């Protein structure tokens, strides 16, 4: 096996050497630890056929960190191959040299990189540009000593737009790890030159050319207007990332644009069709598009204000896309499309996804809280859902009703009778507590509030801390409001929560309630049953400082998670 | 009437989860069509395929009445298939085991030692709080018999009934008295287990 393979690889016949190389590649791909034979394959490296040279280079790259000591026998071969007339061989050698993760090998590779930096072949130039970035990532000090920054800077100002884009990408990668000292930023002439090659750059080069403008900060409207005019054609790119990159560049440039001029209006009008087109991409890109829309929605919501139909989740849409569709609809929800939003939510409540149902209920509640003009419609929909006899739907409706009552309970007394008998046997802590709180605060439209609380007092000492606290608060409120029918109920609650209640917070609350009852029951009406101020809703809009930073970081990992780039990298 | 081996080979030939689900649905459509026709000749193959699909993770709710019908059947293979289906897809929470009490009572007095044993095993495996209430009288009748192969089954059924109905242990005291002289190891083990449970 191993001995036979070594003998075949140590033969003078190329027909057996190629088969041995193929078998070694298959074993490594099949999951065989062939790193022990690295020195044996070192001899069979300088071959005229390019088919075996690529396999040897790949094996060395995959077996470079494993046997760094045995890799010292390849510098001469790389140096010899870095001068072959064929551009493909030189490019392969340059790619393999930078892929070798050897600390003692990159030192001697500086000369080949310098020689290939000024290569006439555009493929050789691209390979050298990639190898320079790889070496800088491996060793920044070696790259700085070699003086490759000056050569990289001149790459952008030369011919071969593919090579220029590769050099720009390498410079951006180097500056990304750089401490911002001695930045590679360029004046407006460099930006114009890069834009000149943007129309001739490839799909991959287009992203590299557009990423450079993401760091530049415009200072004048004329420069910003020219940049916007040049990036306008980028919205008609078939590549989804190119369109996203153009949109991000336009958003970044809009921070210096003036809304008084008509350029801002044209940019806003030309961006909605791009968002609509991006919303029809692959399901994998659907999540990225939704994240980008949510990030840009909080900044300029007037662009996609009239775009509501495209936010509807499709039947075959993925779960990750369905969840983002609800968030997009909630962020773009308005009274103009309130009926459409309610209809979409009603249809989303007939599915089978428990997580999807909970998300739909939360979105409906958020839409009802945000806009008070559709409060009656939301209440009617919640009542219909509660009558639908769905356990998860019932819990979601109970939570939504409890949230709405604390927000807009002035005209919420017309639904207390319907919720008085709505299957209170549900044991969900998020629903039972909400129902208890609603009964305690809304103990005026129901004449059987005391009777309902009797069923919930059977296991108050062993139900839950939050549930017990809510029940105690409801009992105290009922006693303060109507103490004739709840005189003994308050005493029983105090006895159960003060004598048999071992909860520290619950025991303290019970003791405080007992002291208030025994001190001044009249004062408890103005102390306990007081008019609370308006509840401050938790705003879903991000902080303006984070939005500005998130605006520049568009299409990256920090945008999908909606977190700062330094709060997620390791 | 596809054979169980053919269905197993077809299932093993499925690689993708979606492909396996599609094949299972295609087989279940034919199974439901055969059941709706009141098939009685090759019902064993359909029952085996349905049991395999249920064990493979497919629903078998519609295949409840067919098992009840096969339990009260006369074919030995059909009776065995019905007993297996009742043991597998039948439980206390099913709510369809109430009708199985009549079938168990009918098969409890069967002269065949295998049908009665199969019914007793099914009752022990799927004992209910109400089935044991209406089956306690028949269990005690078989507990006083001298059938060595049936003594262990009767002891197991009594133990299951006592576990399901602890208040019915009073009816087993006069039946297990003077039962420590059994020569058979299984009968002695069953008697010891019943005494320990009591």
């Amino acid at each position: 096996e191993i001995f036979e393979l070594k003998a075949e690889l140590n033969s003078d016949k190329k027909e057996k050497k190629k088969e041995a190389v193929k078998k070694v590649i298959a074993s490594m791909t099949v999951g065989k630890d062939v790193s022990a034979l690295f020195p044996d394959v070192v001899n069979c490296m300088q071959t005229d056929n390019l088919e075996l040279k690529k396999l040897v280079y790949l094996y060395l790259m995959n077996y470079a960190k494993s046997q760094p000591d045995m890799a010292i026998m390849a510098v001469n071969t790389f140096v010899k191959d870095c001068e072959d007339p064929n551009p493909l061989i030189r490019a392969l050698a340059v790619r393999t040299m930078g892929c070798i993760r050897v600390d003692k090998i990159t030192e001697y590779l500086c000369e080949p990189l310098r020689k290939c930096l000024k290569d006439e072949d555009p493929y050789v130039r691209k390979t050298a540009a990639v190898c320079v970035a790889k070496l800088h990532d491996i060793n920044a000090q070696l790259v700085e000593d070699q003086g490759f920054l000056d050569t990289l800077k001149d790459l952008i100002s030369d011919s071969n737009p593919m090579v220029v884009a590769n050099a720009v990408a390498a410079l951006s990668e180097i500056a990304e790890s750089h401490p911002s000292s001695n930045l590679l930023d360029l004046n407006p002439q460099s930006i114009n030159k890069l834009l000149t090659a943007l129309n001739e750059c490839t799909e991959w080069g287009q992203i590299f050319i557009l990423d450079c403008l993401a760091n530049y900060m415009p200072k004048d409207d004329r420069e910003a207007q020219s940049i916007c005019e040049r990036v306008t054609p980028r919205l008609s790119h078939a590549n989804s990332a190119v369109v996203l990159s153009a949109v991000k560049v336009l958003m970044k440039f809009m921070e210096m644009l003036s809304k008084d001029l008509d350029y801002y209006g044209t940019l806003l009008k030309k961006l909605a069709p791009p968002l609509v087109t991006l919303l029809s991409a692959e399901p994998e890109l659907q999540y990225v598009a939704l994240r980008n829309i949510n990030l840009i929605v909080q900044k300029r919501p007037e662009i996609l204000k009239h775009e509501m139909k495209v936010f509807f989740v499709k039947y075959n849409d993925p779960i990750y896309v369905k969840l983002e569709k609800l968030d997009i609809m909630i962020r773009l929800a308005s009274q103009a499309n309130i009926a459409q939003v309610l209809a979409e939510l009603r249809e989303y409540a007939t599915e089978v996804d428990v997580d999807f149902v909970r998300k739909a209920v939360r979105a409906i509640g958020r839409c009802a809280i945000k806009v008070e003009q559709s409060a009656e419609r939301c209440v009617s929909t919640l009542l219909d859902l509660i009558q639908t006899k769905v356990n998860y739907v019932v819990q979601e409706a109970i939570v939504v009703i409890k949230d709405i009552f604390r927000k807009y309970p002035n005209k919420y007394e017309s639904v207390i009778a319907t919720l008085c008998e709505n299957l209170d046997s549900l044991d969900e802590p998020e629903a039972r507590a909400a129902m208890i709180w609603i009964v305690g605060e809304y103990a005026e439209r129901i004449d059987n509030a005391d009777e309902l609380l009797e069923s919930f007092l059977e296991g108050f000492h062993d139900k839950s801390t939050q549930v017990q606290l809510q029940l105690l608060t409801a009992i105290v409120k009922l006693f303060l409001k109507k103490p004739t029918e709840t005189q003994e109920l308050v005493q029983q609650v105090l006895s159960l929560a003060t004598q048999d209640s071992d909860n520290p917070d619950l025991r303290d609350r019970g003791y405080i309630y007992w002291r208030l009852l025994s001190t001044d029951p009249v004062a408890a009406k103005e102390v306990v049953l007081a008019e609370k101020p308006l509840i401050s809703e938790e705003t879903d809009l991000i902080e303006p400082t984070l939005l500005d930073e998130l605006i520049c970081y568009i299409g990256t990992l920090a945008s999908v998670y909606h977190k700062p780039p330094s709060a997620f990298v390791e | 009437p596809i054979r169980l081996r053919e269905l197993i080979r077809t299932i093993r030939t499925a690689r993708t989860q979606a492909e396996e689900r599609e094949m299972i649905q295609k087989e279940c459509a034919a199974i439901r069509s055969s059941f709706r026709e009141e098939d009685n000749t090759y019902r064993c193959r359909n029952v085996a395929k349905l049991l395999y699909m249920h064990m493979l993770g497919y629903p078998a709710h519609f295949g409840q009445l067919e098992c009840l019908k096969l339990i009260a059947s006369q074919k030995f293979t059909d009776k065995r298939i019905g007993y297996l289906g009742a043991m597998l897809l039948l439980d206390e929470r099913q709510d369809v085991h109430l009708l199985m009490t009549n079938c168990i009572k009918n098969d409890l007095n069967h002269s065949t030692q295998f049908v009665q044993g199969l019914a007793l095993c099914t009752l022990g495996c799927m004992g209910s709080s109400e089935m044991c209430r209406d089956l306690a009288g028949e269990v005690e009748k078989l507990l006083k018999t001298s059938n060595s192969y049936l003594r262990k089954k009767a002891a197991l059924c009594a133990v299951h009934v006592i576990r399901k109905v602890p208040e019915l242990m009073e009816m087993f005291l006069p039946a297990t008295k003077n039962l420590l002289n059994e020569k058979n190891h299984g009968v002695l083990h069953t008697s010891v287990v019943l005494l320990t449970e009591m």
Partner: protein
Amino acid sequence: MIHFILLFSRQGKLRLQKWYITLPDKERKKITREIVQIILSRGHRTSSFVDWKELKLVYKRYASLYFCCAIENQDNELLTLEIVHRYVELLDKYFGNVCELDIIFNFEKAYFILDEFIIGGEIQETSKKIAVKAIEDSDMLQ
């Protein structure tokens, strides 16, 4: 008494299952998945005993396919292993060099043998030849 007995393969596929506790179908599936994950996520020196949900879940696989049991905390643990070994030997004797292929195809015979051997989580016959003779007599009835 054995709460449940499950025959599952190393890949996770279950070739046999017999639970003596009336549980919901979704609950039973979740319990089976958890047991498979625990057994599949255990080493070869775990003692073949697991206390899952206060149940002495014993795992003892003599081949690629393993075996599982659910014994309450009221009896010895070695008794379950002895019973499992006896059941495996009886199945091999009845089948004749029992392999994984015959288990999937001959699941009905294995279920019948288990029913004739263990009923309600407890054993039905201590001997190994009497059970084989009874199974053969039952099968010969047609």
